Amino acid sequence: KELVLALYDYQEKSPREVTMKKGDILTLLNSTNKDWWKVEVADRQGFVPAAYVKKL
């Protein structure tokens, strides 16, 4: 339920990824992996690179 800030645009590159735009406020769903975090972007869910978001 915590929020993260998208630090960069990111276009999804595989089925389980999701696209985000810089400045988007995402809901953090799963941060157990060091490299890929599962997030909700508007009403879509998927993985983005952990380095490209910042916990709020």
Ligand code: PRO
């Ligand atoms: O699904 C895959 O294989 C790639 C690598 C991790 C996230 N997307």
